[PDB]
């Protein structure tokens, strides 16, 4: 196993949401086999961010997910060469973006080159007014579509005032190494949370727990 029980995480995101440019650095640790990771995020340019930090967080690696013996682990088989993913997020009020991560490994560290581009968010909407509280726990449906491993998520951000703001993610995953065998269809349950933050979310601690299953208890 190229992958140790304790891996470090290094991360730089460059992005633009509704024109606003920003650069964010990440430093964290994770237990790939337990499906748990936590990282410290710091806005380096464009702070304070004039949009809800929450829209970024699923962009800050499915190598951190507990996979049972009876499901092919595409992600942990992708290393040490690594893999990329591209995501389109579609929000109920027309907000749309495209995120991509190119993930590499050097010794005991995952390096993440992340790009995040959002547009079409209404000025008066919860994202540009900062009314989001958190992502609800999700289930990612994994299946193969024209020879590409694809994950679908139908989820929502909880807003101030008991309201939900609906998300649809589609992610395409691709190993760098030709001939990493595709898995069969399956599910990954996700638990993403902001553990702490300063006034304007210039510093954020982020935690994710993920578990792969076939649908049964």
Residue numbers in the entry: 2 to 61, 65 to 221
Passage from the reporting paper:
Structurally, rsKiiro is similar to green fluorescent protein (GFP) with an 11-stranded β-barrel surrounding an α helix. The chromophore of rsKiiro is formed from the Ala-Tyr-Gly tripeptide at residue numbers 62–64 in the α helix.
In this study, we probed the light-induced reverse reaction, from the Trans to Cis chromophore conformation, initiated with 2 ms 405 nm pulses at a range of optical flash energy densities (0.1–6.7 mJ/mm2) after the initial Cis-to-Trans photoconversion had been driven to completion using ∼13 mW/mm2 of 473 nm CW illumination. From these images, 79,976 single-crystal indexed diffraction patterns were obtained and merged into 6 data sets for each corresponding laser energy density. Data below a value of 0.5 in Fourier shell correlation were discarded, leading to a uniform limit of 1.7 Å being applied to all data sets. The initial examination of the chromophore-omitted maps clearly shows increasing occupancy of the Cis state at higher energy densities.
